[model samples]
Target: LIVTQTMKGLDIQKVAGTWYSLAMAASDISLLDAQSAPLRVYVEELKPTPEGDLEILLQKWENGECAQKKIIAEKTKIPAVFKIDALNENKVLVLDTDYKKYLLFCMENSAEPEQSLVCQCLVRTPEVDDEALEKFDKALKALPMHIRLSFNPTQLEEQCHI
Candidate 1:
C-alpha cells in the first residue's frame, strides 16, 4: 500500500479551517439567491468532533445582519461522503479539496428541483485567487450554471440599533 493507516474517512483535522464562499450552485440556479436562500451558506469553519465527524460552523445574512449556523457532518463508511442531519436527509460529499487553498463541497438532497446537487465553492480568502478560481470552475464544470456571491461587510451595512 502507498500509505499505512492513512486512508479512511475525511481527515477532519486537515479540513478544519475558515473558508469564505466564492459561489454556490444548484441544478436550479435560482436557489442561490443573494438574500434569504436556504442553500446559500458561507462556511466559516469545519471543526472536528470527537465522534469522527465534522462540525461545520457557517455564516449567513439574516435581516441584513450576520448570522451563525452550526451542523455536524456524520462520518459514513465512504471516505468522501457524509450524512448531514441538519438539512433534511441530505448527503454531503467532499467533491475535492487541497485544504491549503480551496474546498469543493457537493450536497445532494432527494427533493426535486430546489434541493438537488447543491454545491459550494469555498476558498481561504474572501477573494479567490486565480488558480483557485480556475480549479473551482473545473471541479463544477458538470453543473450547468452558477452565480458569484459577496460576503464582505460593506455589502450589508447599517446603523446599529440603540
Candidate 2:
C-alpha cells in the first residue's frame, strides 16, 4: 500500500519556467539550511483563476534575500496534484517533469502517507549532468528514509550566487 503518484497530464503551462535549485530532500532541518543556499525557484506568472485554480508567482533565493511567494494551485483530480491550502495539509506534487530541463517536486503529507515531507530537484543549468546526476540518484532512492538529502555543490556556481 504505497501510494504516492503524481504527474499525469501536468501541463501547468508546461510547468512555468526558471527553476534551478538542484537538490533538496527533507524531513526539514530548516530544509537542511535551505539546501546550502543559492537557490532559485522562479515559476513565472501563471494565472488562471476563476475557480479553475492556479495562480503562481513564487520567486525564491532564501538567505541572501529575494523571497516572494503567492501560489494558489488547487486543481486536483490527480493530474500533477496540487491543493495548497496555504500549505496546510500539504499536497503539491508535480513529482517529475521535463518542460525543458528538470523539475521534480514533492510534499505529500496528508497526514503522512508514509513519507515525503518534501523533495525538490529543479534544474535548468548550474551544469548538472551525469545523466542528470544519475537522475538525482535514482530519485532519491525512491523516497522514504525520513528524507534528508543534499546535493547542491558540484561547484554550485561558486557556492552562493546564481
Candidate 3:
C-alpha cells in the first residue's frame, strides 16, 4: 500500500501559511508592475518539501502569454523571516517583519527561466502565483491613475519549535 502524508505545522510552527506575490516578471525583464503586460508567479499554495524547506508554485501570465513554475522552497531551521528579492536570480534575503534586512542567500537555479519553467532556489520561496498576478494587476491599474501599488506575502514565516 502506498500512502501520501500531509504536513501540518505545530503550535509553535514557525512556517505555516500562504505567501503572496509582490512583484512581476515580464519577458526576461523584472518589473515591479507589469501593468497589463504578462504577469505570473507561484501562489495557489506553499507546500512543505521533504528537505525541510517549503515548496512553492508560481503561475505566470504575461505579454499575451502564461506559464507556471513550481520551484518553491523555504528554510525550516530558521524562523520564517525573509523575503524573495529576485526569483529570476533565485535569491532570498532575510528581513524583519517591518521589512528589515537580516541574512541573505544566493539561490542557484539549474534551469533557466523560459516558457513556464520551475526553478528551484536552495534557500528561498518562489513568488506566489496568485499574489504576483494580483500585484501586477494593481501595478497596471495604478499606471494610468498614477497610484502607487503595494504588495507582499500576507503571512510571515513562523519558527517551528518542535
lDDT for residue 99 in candidate 1, whole number 0-100: 77
Please, what is the TM-score per model? 0.76, 0.29, 0.35
Worst 10 residues of 1 by lDDT: 153-162
Model 3 lowest lDDT segment of ten: 96-105
**Candidate 2: regions farther than 4 A off:** 1-9, 12-21, 29-78, 82-92, 95-98, 113-116, 122-126, 129-162
Q: What is candidate 1's TM-score against the reference?
A: 0.76
lDDT measured at residue 133 in model 3 versus the true structure, 0 to 100: 45
Candidate with more favorable, higher TM-score: 1 or 2: 1
- Which structure among the candidates has the greatest TM-score? 1
- In the range 1-162, model 3's lDDT, one tens digit per residue, is 111111222211333344433332322332223533222243544565555565555555544444555654455444442223245444332221211111111132224333222211111343334533443443333122222233344422211100
RMSD of each: 6.6, 15.1, 14.5
lDDT of 2 by residue, 107-146 (tens): 5467754533566666666656456545655765756534
- Computed on alpha carbons, the lDDT of every model, listed in order, comes to 0.63, 0.57, 0.33
Best candidate (score: lDDT): 1
lDDT of 1 by residue, 49-150 (tens): 766688888766667776778987888887677788764436777777787877777676645424456676777765646676676667666565555443
Show how many residue pairs clash in every candidate, following the order shown: 0, 0, 22
Show where candidate 1 strays beyond 4 Å: 1-10, 111-114, 146-162
